[PDB]
Amino acid sequence: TDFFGLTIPFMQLLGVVPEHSGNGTARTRLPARADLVNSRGDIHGGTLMSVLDFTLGAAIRGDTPEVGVATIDMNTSFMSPGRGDLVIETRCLRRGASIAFCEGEIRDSAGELVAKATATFKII
Amino acid sequence: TDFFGLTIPFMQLLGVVPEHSGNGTARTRLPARADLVNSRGDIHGGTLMSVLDFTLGAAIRGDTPEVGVATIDMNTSFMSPGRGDLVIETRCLRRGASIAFCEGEIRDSAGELVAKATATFKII
Amino acid sequence: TDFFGLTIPFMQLLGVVPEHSGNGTARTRLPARADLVNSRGDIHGGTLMSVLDFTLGAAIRGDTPEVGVATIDMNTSFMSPGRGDLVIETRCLRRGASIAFCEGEIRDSAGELVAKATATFKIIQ
Amino acid sequence: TDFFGLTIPFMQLLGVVPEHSGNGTARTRLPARADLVNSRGDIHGGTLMSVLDFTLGAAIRGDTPEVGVATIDMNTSFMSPGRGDLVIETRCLRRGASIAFCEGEIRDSAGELVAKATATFKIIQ
Q: Is Kinase among this UniProt entry's keywords (chains C, D) (predicted)?
């Protein structure tokens, strides 16, 4: 599978679908699967942090795909339980020669806020 | 599979192995699999945040398994790339009636620091 | 001194001015001072988090000065050195019966992002 | 004023005292003051992050006052209201050529955890 110009075994396991990236943003979609679920039947937070990580970075190497990106730190807030196909949109807040700052949110089909995250990246 | 007294489809997909929990701590082990890998062949950060989330919470409901736990927010720092079987140890820093604070680290077979995380939980 | 319905001896000390609070958002302002600077001459990041802490909570208790809000945890990103007067604006992302989520940013006179922060809150009621 | 090799006008303003820096750890102390309190009478969390910011960096540039460290991002957890004199102690978790990771905690005279924080740093060299 092609994830924004890169192969990623774990993202292929999660079945996430890359939709867009460019102009400092990126959009990913997470289809529902009983595999990715919580102990309460909700989409596991780990699952959300995974696709969010992917998407967060893609908002950097979408304006510049020749660039290498590595997550330094990432903060996630879980607002409400995720269920059914989700959509992840991220946005790059500031980009430098070495460091880039990003953010994003996960929303359900009903447009409600499932989770929000912000991260720091090392631009290789 | 039994994960500290709970079924979790996503943790079963990741193949993580619960080893211990109690007295405010918990220990999990993540076996190596090519499925859980990075674009650089390293264990994906999302994968680390997943097992860390599991383990972080388990350090609360190990002293009290009758308790329900839900992650509010979680911060993760990635120190060095993870490879080969990893071990995750977490520790509860403060527990209240409503809120609990946790922390943990992931280390490789060589005992080096792969990642570190801290989280906030709602004790149900 | 009046900080959206309460006196905060530390805030009064930072020389910060409350600009708005209500409908899930808030505004505050940090007039430049030399008491408040780093060693690089820039406004100290702690000065930033202090005013950001103050203002993030305000976006919750403006819709209700009847409630109490205590910061649980806060994450702050440092994008650009802060200088001169700064304006701080926050928004509540979600409000529960017990837990509140907020975010915000600090900008300089030139409108450039100085720092951005997110916070979790305990609403005391 | 001497803060491990530099003057910080804001820190000097908080009335904080440098207690140690070297070998990947650091210590600082926050003598109680009324200028530094919340509205609940507790020491303002911003006062905490300010001193925590100061001290986290110190755990890096004590092994080398030759280098510069700039805070990239910081996460702070609030566990217990802070009161009376507080002691701040940090440790460097990892040091790269460009990026440094640190953590730390604030405790009261009774030794109870007031707040814990983690931070990422840019080492300027």
A: no
Residues in Cβ contact with A104 at an 8 Å cutoff, skipping those fewer than 6 apart: A52, A55, A56, A59, A88, A89, A90, A91, A116, A117, A118
Length of chain C: 125
Domain boundaries of chain A, sorted by first residue? 1-124
Q: Give me the CATH code for the C1-125 domain, please.
A: 3.10.129.10
The residue written with tokens 């820190």 in the block is D11
Q: At what angle do helices A45-58 and B45-58 cross, to 10 degrees?
A: 150
Experimental method: X-ray
Q: How far apart are CA D83 and CA D42, in angstroms?
A: 6
Contact list in C for residue A118 (CB cut-off 8 A) is: 75, 77, 116, 118
User: Closest by alpha carbon to C117, among C107, B54, C108, C125?
Assistant: C107
Would you state the torsion angle of the CA atoms of residues C22, B122, B44, D77, taken in this order, to the nearest 10 degrees?
Answer: 70
- What pairing do the DSSP bridges indicate for beta strands C99-108 and D25-30? unpaired
Chosen for mutation from D76, D80, D94 (greatest number of chain B CBs closer than 10 Å) is D94
Residue A124 near chain D (CB below 8 Å) = no
Interchain pair B101, D94: CB under 8 A: no
Inter-residue contact C49 to D75 (CB < 8 Å) = no
A1-124 domain in CATH 3.10.129.10? yes
**What would the two tokens of residue C61 be?**
């208790």
> What DSSP state is assigned to residue C39?
S
Q: How far apart are CA D16 and CA D7, in angstroms?
A: 12
Q: Which residues of C touch B122 (CB under 8 A)?
A: 98-99
Q: Which residues of C touch B73 (CB under 8 A)?
A: 72-73, 75, 120
